[PDB]
């Protein structure tokens, strides 16, 4: 049971697609992570509510780094 969206690889947080409190669906893109001339939509692992967004747009993140917590 997944509660935290973490970075699958290092990247730059290009865009955060949802806000705290928003309802989300499994497989929905929640943010866009840029890496190696590619824009990766990072999905919600489950239906739920966005509780916390732990990064800002522009931020560089490393592998496994927490990005979003679901409530």
Author numbering: 79 to 149
Study authors write:
In the PhBCCP system (PhBCCPΔN79) residue 138 was selected as the target residue for the mutation experiment because it is a solvent-exposed and nonconserved residue on a surface β-sheet. The isoleucine mutant (A138I) and the tyrosine mutant (A138Y) conferring residue 138 with the highest crystal-packing propensities for β-sheet provided better crystallization scores when compared with other constructs, including the wild type. Neither the C orthorhombic nor the trigonal crystals could be obtained with the wild-type protein. Therefore, it is conceivable that the substitution of Ala by Ile/Tyr with a better crystal-packing propensity created novel packing interfaces. In terms of buried ASA, the residue at position 138 in the mutant crystals contributes more to crystal packing when compared with that in the wild-type crystal.
We previously determined the crystal structure of the C-terminal 73-residue fragment of PhBCCP (PhBCCPΔN76) that represents the biotinyl(/lipoyl attachment) domain of the hypothetical methylmalonyl-CoA decarboxylase γ chain. This domain adopts a flattened β-barrel comprising two homologous ‘hammerhead’ structures that confer an intramolecular pseudo-twofold symmetry reflecting the gene duplication. In this work, we used the C-terminal 70-residue fragment of PhBCCP (PhBCCPΔN79) as the template to prevent the N-terminal heterogeneity that was observed in PhBCCPΔN76. Moderate deviations of up to 2.53 Å were observed at residues 114–116, which constitute a flexible β-turn harbouring the Lys115 residue to be biotinylated.
